[PDB]
């Protein structure tokens, strides 16, 4: 299962793959993917 | 003037929920937002399906020379009302509490901002039952922060708690989540009666005449069309009009009778009563009314009859109730809309007649149709208005011949008085216009059946690219007067021609091909829309001194007085200016009345009235005062010098009031009218060039050109933005030199530069043809730098043909999947990582089919590797539904690279050329490296001298802390701008003139002469976002093998036989582009009746090519299915352009062919 | 967005001195040369704090991730 965020309730979802997509709780049908931890490197310039 | 900084912060941090902080944003949009306001409320849609009517529908039966014939089962049906529901969600129930929808989620969803439309269908069965029942007929789009959406009124505050930004401006439909908008078009005056000499004309009917009058009547529902006198040789007057994309043409004396009931010596002494006996125009209205005499009949019911038997046709009248009726809704559908009383349309159209027989004579000068004192504009929601009523008249006459055919077929249902049947011809037809409205907004292809008086219908629509500020606003402010125009390439209307002081900016006008048309409006120019009104105007005129007769009460002098299209008295030109002069008075001190506590009575005269008085002169114009109310006018403030307040006018008596332009311009007597600050003629975005009167001209204009186009601050609320390419600078700050106004109209929300420490010196050699450096330390600490975000969406209903079900859906198969790629960036959802760094051959995005099961991808086509900031799983729509959309937001990367164009708010645009190391830079004294140095040689034959005095000004503003005032028009010749920053720096500590001792870096010693460093503004642009394409080999085409679609030819090779290189020309083009050695047959000398030998022997020796043209056992050979031939051994080598083996082929295929003969 | 930490021309450090010169015109009664007090002596690192923008305190008011 992943972890999204309702648009405007800003709620955890999770909704896994194949299902009905809307707000658990506000019934909003916008769905942002939140930034998990994973390593990346910049150089300072 | 400071800075405001300590507001700046407290209107951020907290922000203000009593009231939007920046009224004039909102007075600038306000054209748009409150022509939509004037659209549903104050009566607007209601008069237009008033004014459609009411049609009919019945069993016919044949008269059989009856003559009346029958039909009594009759339904006559109109449209009551119109109501434009708030934009609920998808409004049938989804099991969830009906909530609304906010346009942001409109942006995000990528779903149009629609609402629901209901009319109100009333019905009649021949009786008097009249039942009603409202109709959904579709949903139409709603425009932000207008009316009927659902942040009216709401304060900055709760527009941050929605997701849209604190002060938003309104004014765009949302129409697939692409910020549509109507540009506002320039058309004739409503309902003045102007004069046209167009040559045209002349062509045009052989015997008639250039001499015309031109009139665009409108009715109550700004529903207009026009209706034109053309003066013919013989004499007479024909009243052309249109209807249904057609001209139509009766003679003017054939309605002149047959509007009121009229004897000839009334029209006689109506046209030319006056003067007993003037020659010219006693003898041209004698032959009129003998060559109508000619042919037609003497009283008004037989002119009626004639009339109504010639345009039944045509009209869309009822077809069996009578014929008479017909004429009468011919003089009250077409002939002049705007009047209502037949003998008013009378009345006017004799003063019509007059003006152009004045015309014809000399004694009246032409007006001119390309200028602004004969235009108006036409707003946003008036043309939805005019587009929403045309698309009900024609369901109503859809539903209209439903019924027609439905009673024609035998009669399978006729039944009038059942309600099933309204329901089952309801059901019929299409009863969806909402798309068709959603379609005129997405596309602009104005596609109706009557233009509604639109000479272009193309191209209506603007989208709303918020890429920087200036730029949506000056989408907001513009006009347009058509490409109709553009077409003709003419020294006309492109002309800036002076009746726009203070409306239309002078300067402000994009450069090229549509310079010219589109001018964009002045800073304070408003435009009245919500008329009033005006009955008080004809119950003072009647006080004041004039009378409107019944008969002829007109002689020489008296001159006409027309309120708005209707003729209300005649009074002499003396009583005329005494009347215009109080009337305006009565205005000016009655609105300062109803500003105050006093009480605020419906106006006796309203402020947006103008007061046309035309003054007589020969060869002049044609006089007669002109009181005009009707909305969608140009209108500007002055102050009143006699009282002390405002007043405002219009594009038509700017041409007759001396509007002295300072207080200390008023000469007594005569100026009767200050402007408020000339800073008022120029635009919103031209304004905001400091000291923008120093520089020649073309230089500001195209300073306004290149300003609409910095990467610059789109807003503040990026992260909830679906469009396509954003630009953003990560380093802006306000500038040190600025106009008052750029604090006004609320800019500080929206940087566009930063300050370069700008040397004007030319020292490094990099910076000739205009380029300049950037001090690379300067640039390394972060100088301009800018982001890019590319927001791509992907949509598997495309890929959907049709036959099957929804099959493909965002994820991984269960079963395996790559590791090479698809795992290091998808997650597991075949949604990209966020945060993850991308290159050009990139996975972005994961689906699979059902049947195959097998996991499709999509790669990511730009160029440039960017990251990915946020993705959005788009619900399809209303609910139950699985992700079928997701729009990711890359955000690329763009420092200051080597061709990225700077350019200071003065047209002096530059490329960073080589970024010098910031060691190697000047230094003064204090040890500053000039952030970027400027060419001294760019500033002659360019006069930005405007930019030493901004320089000026922003080496002495730094210095103490002022925001340096620079306003147009504040410094005089007295003592001048330039000394003013000087005494500021004397002050400060640096030289006056502003120069500054620098040493070299690369000697050490001093450079002889000083050197001028000042403080520029620096916007960086964003016109190198289109950048290089190296091609060494590739694919080649498919017919001519020739590279795929750089390109040499044409000229190229012009230039390449010039230099006398037959060797180079031969290289580069057909060696280089498509090279092939084709077999030729050298006896029978064609190239395609060749064959490659089959099956000689084993592999043996070489396949020898023979002929088949020139054909009839070492010698003989077989072919491919068999069949052996002889003959044709003469066959070599040659060397020529695969483009003519495919020219061969093309040119067999017609039988010809050519016969290339080889030694 | 926030405020750019060492001034271009100059090489001074300057990211600390914002939260302390705005603290300066908010109560203090000093106008526009309250940098002065801060130590900025040139004009290339002074017309930085002076002028500047401060637009992410405008820009952090639209948290997705806000609960509520
Ligand atoms: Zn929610
Ligand atoms: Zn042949
Ligand atoms: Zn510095």
Same mark, same amino acid.
């Given at each position: 299962?992943?972890?999204?965020?309702?648009?405007?309730?800003?709620?955890?979802?999770?909704?896994?793959?194949?299902?009905?997509?809307?707000?658990?709780?506000?019934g909003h049908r916008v769905m942002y993917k939140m930034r998990t931890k994973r390593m990346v490197q910049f150089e300072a310039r | 003037m400071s800075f405001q900084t300590l507001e700046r912060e407290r209107t951020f941090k907290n922000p203000p929920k009593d009231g939007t902080? +920046?009224?004039?944003?909102?007075?600038?949009?306000?054209?748009?937002?409150?022509?939509?306001?004037?659209?549903?409320?104050?009566?607007?849609?209601?008069? !237009?399906?008033?004014?459609?009517?009411?049609?009919?529908?019945?069993?016919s039966i044949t008269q059989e020379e009856g003559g009346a014939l029958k039909f009594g089962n009759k339904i006559s049906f109109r449209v009551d009302e119109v109501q434009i529901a708030k934009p609920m969600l998808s409004s049938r129930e989804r099991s969830s509490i009906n909530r609304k929808v906010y346009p942001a989620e409109a942006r995000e969803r990528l779903t149009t901002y629609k609402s629901r439309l209901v009319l109100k269908f009333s019905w009649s069965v021949n009786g008097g039952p009249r039942q009603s029942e409202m109709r959904e007929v579709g949903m139409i789009p709603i425009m932000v922060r207008s009316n009927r959406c659902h942040l009216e009124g709401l304060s900055p505050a709760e527009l941050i708690a929605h997701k849209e930004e604190s002060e938003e401006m309104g004014g765009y439909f949302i129409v697939n989540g692409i910020?549509?908008?109507? &540009?506002?078009?320039?058309?004739?005056?409503?309902?003045?009666?102007?004069?046209?000499?167009?040559?045209?004309?002349?062509?045009?009917?052989?015997?008639?005449?250039?001499?015309?009058?031109?009139? &665009?009547?409108?009715?109550?529902? =700004?529903?207009? *069309?026009?209706?034109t006198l053309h003066y013919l040789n013989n004499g007479v007057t024909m009243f052309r009009f249109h209807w249904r994309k057609n001209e139509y043409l009766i003679p003017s004396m054939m309605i002149l009778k047959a509007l009121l009931e009229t004897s000839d010596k009334e029209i006689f002494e109506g046209i030319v009563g006056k003067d007993l006996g003037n020659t010219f125009l006693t003898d041209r209205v004698e032959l009129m009314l003998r060559a109508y005499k000619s042919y037609g009949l003497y009283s008004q019911t037989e002119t009626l009859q004639y009339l109504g038997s010639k345009f039944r046709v045509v009209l869309g009248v009822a077809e069996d109730l009578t014929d008479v009726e017909v004429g009468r809704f011919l003089l009250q559908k077409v002939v002049l809309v705007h009047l209502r009383?037949?003998?008013?349309?009378?009345?006017?159209?004799? +003063?019509?007649? &007059?003006?152009?027989?004045?015309?014809?004579?000399?004694?009246?000068?032409?007006?001119?149709?390309?200028?602004?004192?004969? =235009?108006?504009?036409?707003?946003?929601?008036?043309?939805?208005?005019?587009?929403?009523?045309?698309?009900?008249?024609?369901?109503?006459?859809?539903?209209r011949a439903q019924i027609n055919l439905d009673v024609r077929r035998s009669a399978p249902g006729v039944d009038f008085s059942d309600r099933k049947y309204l329901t089952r011809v309801f059901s019929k037809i299409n009863n969806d216009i909402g798309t068709k409205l959603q379609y005129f907004l997405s596309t602009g292809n104005l596609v109706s059946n009557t233009g509604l008086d639109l000479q272009q219908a193309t191209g209506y629509t603007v989208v709303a690219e918020k890429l920087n500020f200036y730029r949506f606003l000056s989408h907001f402010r513009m006009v347009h007067r058509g490409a109709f +125009?553009?077409?003709?390439?003419?020294?006309?209307?492109?002309? *800036?021609?002076?009746?726009?002081?203070?409306?239309?900016?002078?300067?402000?006008?994009?450069?090229?091909?549509?310079?010219?048309?589109?001018?964009?409006?002045?800073?304070?120019?408003?435009?009245?829309?919500?008329?009033?009104?005006?009955?008080?105007?004809?119950?003072?005129?009647?006080?004041?001194?004039?009378?409107?007769?019944?008969?002829?009460?007109?002689?020489?002098?008296?001159?006409?007085?027309?309120?708005?299209?209707?003729?209300?008295?005649?009074?002499?030109?003396?009583?005329?200016?005494?009347?215009?002069?109080?009337?305006?008075?009565?205005?000016?001190?009655?609105?300062?009345?109803?500003?105050?506590?006093?009480?605020?009575?419906?106006?006796?005269?309203?402020?947006?009235?103008?007061?046309?008085?035309?003054?007589?002169?020969?060869?002049?114009?044609?006089?007669?005062?002109?009181? +005009?109310?009707?909305p969608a006018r140009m209108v500007r403030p002055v102050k009143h010098i006699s009282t002390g307040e405002l007043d405002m006018?219009?594009?038509?008596?700017?041409?007759?009031?001396?509007?002295?332009?300072?207080?200390?311009?008023?000469?007594?007597?005569?100026?009767?009218?200050?402007?408020?600050?000339?800073?008022?003629?120029?635009?919103?975005?031209?304004?905001?060039?400091?000291?923008?009167?120093?520089? =020649?001209?073309?230089?500001?204009?195209?300073?306004?050109?290149?300003?609409?186009?910095?990467?610059?601050?789109?807003?503040?609320?990026?992260?909830?933005?679906?469009?396509?390419?954003?630009?953003?600078?990560?380093?802006?700050?306000?500038?040190?030199?600025?106009?008052?106004?750029?604090?006004?109209?609320?800019?500080?929300?929206?940087?566009?530069?930063?300050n370069a420490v700008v040397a004007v010196i030319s020292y490094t050699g990099y910076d000739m043809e205009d380029a300049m450096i950037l001090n690379k330390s300067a640039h390394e600490r972060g100088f301009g730098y800018g982001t890019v975000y590319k927001g791509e969406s992907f949509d598997l209903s495309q890929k959907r043909r049709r036959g099957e079900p929804v099959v493909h859906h965002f994820g991984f198969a269960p079963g395996s999947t790559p590791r090479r790629e698809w795992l290091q960036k998808l997650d597991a959802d075949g949604l990209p990582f966020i945060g993850i760094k991308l290159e050009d051959g990139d996975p972005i995005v994961a689906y699979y089919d059902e049947s195959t099961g097998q996991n499709f991808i999509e790669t990511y086509h730009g160029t440039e590797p960017g990251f990915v900031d946020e993705v959005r799983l788009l619900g399809n729509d209303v609910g139950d539904s699985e992700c079928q959309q997701i729009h990711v937001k890359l955000r690329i990367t763009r420092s200051p690279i080597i061709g990225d164009k700077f350019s200071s708010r003065h047209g002096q645009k530059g490329i960073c050329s080589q970024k010098w190391?910031?060691?190697?830079?000047?230094?003064?004294?204090?040890?500053?490296?000039?952030?970027?140095?400027?060419?001294?040689?760019?500033?002659?034959?360019?006069?930005?001298?405007?930019?030493?005095?901004?320089?000026?000004?922003?080496?002495?503003?730094?210095?103490?802390?002022? !925001?340096?005032?620079?306003?147009?028009?504040?410094?005089?010749?007295?003592?001048?701008?330039?000394?003013?920053?000087?005494? =500021?720096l004397v002050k400060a500590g640096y030289n006056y003139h502003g120069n500054e001792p620098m040493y070299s870096g690369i000697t050490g010693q001093e450079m002889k002469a000083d050197i001028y460093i000042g403080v520029v503004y620096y916007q960086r642009l964003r016109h190198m976002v289109s950048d290089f394409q190296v091609r060494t080999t590739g694919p080649i085409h498919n017919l001519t093998r020739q590279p795929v679609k750089i390109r040499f030819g044409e000229m190229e090779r012009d230039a390449v036989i010039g230099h006398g290189t037959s060797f180079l020309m031969q290289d580069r083009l057909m060696n280089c582009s498509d090279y092939a050695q084709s077999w030729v047959c050298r006896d029978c000398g064609s190239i395609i009746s060749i064959m490659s030998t089959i099956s000689m022997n084993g592999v043996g020796s070489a396949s020898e090519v023979r002929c088949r043209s020139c054909a009839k056992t070492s010698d003989i050979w077989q072919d491919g299915s068999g069949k052996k031939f002889v003959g044709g051994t003469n066959t070599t080598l040659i060397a020529l352009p695969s483009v003519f083996n495919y020219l061969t082929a093309e040119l067999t295929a017609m039988n010809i062919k050519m016969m290339l003969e080889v030694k | 967005m926030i405020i750019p930490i060492r001034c271009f021309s100059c090489g001074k450090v300057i990211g600390d001195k914002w939260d302390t010169y705005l603290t300066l015109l908010q109560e203090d009664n000093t106008e526009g040369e309250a940098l002065d007090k801060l130590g900025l002596q040139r004009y290339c690192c002074r017309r930085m704090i002076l002028t500047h923008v401060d637009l992410i305190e405008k820009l952090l008011c639209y948290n997705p991730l806000s609960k509520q």
């Open positions: 299962t992943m972890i999204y965020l309702c648009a405007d309730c800003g709620a955890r979802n999770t909704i896994q793959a194949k299902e009905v997509i809307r707000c658990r709780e506000c | 902080s +920046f009224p004039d944003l909102q007075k600038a949009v306000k054209p748009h937002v409150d022509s939509f306001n004037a659209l549903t409320n104050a009566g607007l849609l209601n008069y !237009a399906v008033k004014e459609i009517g009411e049609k009919c529908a019945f069993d910020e549509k908008l109507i &540009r506002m078009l320039i058309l004739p005056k409503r309902n003045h009666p102007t004069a046209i000499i167009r040559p045209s004309f002349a062509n045009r009917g052989t015997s008639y005449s250039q001499y015309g009058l031109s009139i &665009r009547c409108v009715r109550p529902d =700004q529903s207009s *069309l026009t209706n009383e037949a003998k008013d349309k009378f009345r006017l159209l004799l +003063f019509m007649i &007059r003006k152009l027989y004045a015309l014809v004579a000399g004694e009246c000068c032409a007006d001119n149709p390309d200028s602004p004192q004969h =235009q108006e504009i036409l707003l946003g929601g008036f043309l939805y208005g005019q587009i929403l009523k045309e698309k009900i008249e024609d369901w109503l006459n859809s539903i +125009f553009a077409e003709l390439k003419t020294t006309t209307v492109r002309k *800036l021609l002076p009746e726009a002081w203070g409306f239309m900016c002078p300067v402000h006008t994009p450069d090229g091909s549509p310079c010219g048309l589109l001018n964009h409006l002045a800073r304070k120019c408003e435009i009245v829309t919500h008329p009033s009104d005006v009955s008080q105007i004809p119950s003072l005129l009647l006080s004041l001194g004039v009378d409107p007769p019944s008969v002829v009460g007109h002689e020489s002098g008296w001159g006409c007085v027309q309120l708005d299209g209707k003729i209300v008295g005649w009074c002499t030109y003396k009583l005329a200016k005494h009347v215009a002069d109080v009337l305006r008075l009565m205005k000016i001190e009655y609105a300062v009345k109803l500003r105050n506590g006093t009480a605020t009575e419906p106006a006796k005269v309203p402020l947006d009235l103008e007061i046309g008085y035309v003054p007589p002169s020969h060869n002049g114009q044609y006089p007669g005062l002109y009181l +005009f109310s009707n006018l219009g594009p038509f008596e700017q041409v007759y009031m001396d509007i002295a332009c300072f207080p200390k311009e008023i000469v007594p007597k005569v100026s009767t009218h200050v402007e408020y600050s000339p800073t008022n003629v120029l635009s919103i975005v031209a304004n905001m060039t400091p000291f923008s009167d120093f520089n =020649q001209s073309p230089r500001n204009m195209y300073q306004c050109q290149m300003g609409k186009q910095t990467m610059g601050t789109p807003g503040t609320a990026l992260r909830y933005r679906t469009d396509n390419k954003l630009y953003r600078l990560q380093t802006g700050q306000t500038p040190v030199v600025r106009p008052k106004l750029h604090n006004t109209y609320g800019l500080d929300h929206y940087p566009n530069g930063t190391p910031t060691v190697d830079m000047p230094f003064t004294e204090s040890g500053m490296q000039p952030d970027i140095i400027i060419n001294p040689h760019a500033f002659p034959s360019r006069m930005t001298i405007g930019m030493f005095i901004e320089s000026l000004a922003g080496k002495a503003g730094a210095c103490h802390g002022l !925001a340096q005032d620079s306003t147009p028009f504040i410094y005089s010749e007295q003592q001048t701008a330039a000394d003013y920053f000087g005494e =500021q | -």
